[PDB]
Design a protein around this nucleic acid. Sequence first.
DNA 1: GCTATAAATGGGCA
DNA 2: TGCCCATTTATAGC
Length: 183
Amino acid sequence: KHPSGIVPTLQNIVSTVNLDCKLDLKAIALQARNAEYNPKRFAAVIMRIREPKTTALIFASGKMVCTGAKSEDFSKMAARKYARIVQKLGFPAKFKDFKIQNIVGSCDVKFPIRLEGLAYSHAAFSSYEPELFPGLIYRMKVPKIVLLIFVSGKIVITGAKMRDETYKAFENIYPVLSEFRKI
DNA sequence: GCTATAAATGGGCA
DNA sequence: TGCCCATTTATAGC
């Protein structure tokens, strides 16, 4: 399953769900305490809960974004809590089309990387402009996953909708990181 | 904190 | 017609 012997740690999950009922954001921001609505800046009510530690963006359309959870289950669970709070506030909220939209993972290969050599050998996939951002941007095609590679050996993997894509992206890159280990 | 990465949502605006 | 708007999270160097 994880030939490298390293398993990327899931750090952030963004999911979305349709409450399937229009919402009065101004009424939600007044009644709810764990909220903050400033439409001139963003069209959403920003709500937060302690467990699972997450943040929700609630829109008048009934659409909702859930960010911050450390697992897919935690995300859905948190999304359900927001929906219940909305329901309790007075709206006929449902839990329609729950979908995991992005999973962010990270791991440490515990060895330094020669980013410039890696970038040069994989120019079709890399973007390494150290003066702007210190990490190399590797946009993997299969699976379609973006990996941020640092000299420290620390790797961030994002864009996955299924955790196995995160795991696969890593396993695919491992041999490449090894080939360019900084000695 | 800013730089960069992915993803979803929306109001505004050239 | 597209783009930033704000939110989250790991990462590291101004």
